[PDB]
Amino acid sequence: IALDIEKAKVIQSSIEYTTLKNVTSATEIYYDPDPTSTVIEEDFDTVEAYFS
């Protein structure tokens, strides 16, 4: 690992601390009274694909 850069980078990634807040960009709260469907149109396709 000391003479190889890729394995060293793998070890570095495995050591460094990473929280959810680091990768998160924005969080939102929405009102949706239908458990099996949704009001948002952008995500409607993906969630209906999941449920089906």
Partner 1 sequence: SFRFCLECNNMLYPKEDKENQRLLYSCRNCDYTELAEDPKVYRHELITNIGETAGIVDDIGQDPTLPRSDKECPECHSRDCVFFQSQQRRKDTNMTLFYVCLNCKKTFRDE
Residues of this chain that interact with partner 1 (CB under 8 A) are 21, 24-33, 39
The nearer residue to partner 1, 21 or 52, going by C-beta atoms, is: 21
Residues 6+ apart with CB under 8 A from 41: none
The nearer residue to partner 1, 5 or 26, going by C-beta atoms, is: 26
The nearer residue to partner 1, 4 or 28, going by C-beta atoms, is: 28
CA dihedral 44, 49, 30, 27 (to 10 degrees): -110
- Output the smallest distance, CB 32 to partner 1, in A: 7
Cα gap 22→25, rounded to integer Å:
8
